[PDB]
Amino acid sequence: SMNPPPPETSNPNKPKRQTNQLQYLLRVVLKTLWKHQFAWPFQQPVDAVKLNLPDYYKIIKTPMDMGTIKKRLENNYYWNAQECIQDFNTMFTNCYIYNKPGDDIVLMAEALEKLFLQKINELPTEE
Numbered sequence: 001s002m003n004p005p006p007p008e009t010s011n012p013n014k015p016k017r018q019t020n021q022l023q024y025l026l027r028v029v030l031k032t033l034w035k036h037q038f039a040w041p042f043q044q045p046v047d048a049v050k051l052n053l054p055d056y057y058k059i060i061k062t063p064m065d066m067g068t069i070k071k072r073l074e075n076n077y078y079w080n081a082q083e084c085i086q087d088f089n090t091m092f093t094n095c096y097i098y099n100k101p102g103d104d105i106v107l108m109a110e111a112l113e114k115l116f117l118q119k120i121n122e123l124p125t126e127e
């Protein structure tokens, strides 16, 4: 029922890059989803205490959220675009694992994921 520490957003010994694909993930993908009317539940780690979800972190062992992703991108945490794409996919998957078809939060995830997929379809080739 307690909250875990949040995912890491800083690790000085992790090697870093800022590729054109990572810049697209910040400037296009994250910006698009962040501004959406359904972004709000996803803009920070799930607070299982305030939301009264005592089983959330019993079920979800790889938590992820756009607050974490935003910090990772803005603070250049990644080496490649795949790492960041995986974080978005983990975020959506967790929502579908914990919740049920047709739940409001699932409908919200589905809307954001559609936009995610439309943007990642036009990920630029790496330069």
Ligand SMILES: Cc1nnc2n1-c1ccc(Cl)cc1C(c1ccccc1)=NN2C
Residues within 6 Å of the ligand: 040, 041, 042, 046, 047, 051, 053, 094, 095, 098, 099, 104, 105
């Ligand atoms: C993300 C996420 N995944 N499951 C949840 N959330 C969530 C997180 C934050 C916040 Cl603040 C809420 C939620 C919700 C939620 C339920 C209905 C309408 C809007 C949000 N549900 N829960 C259990």
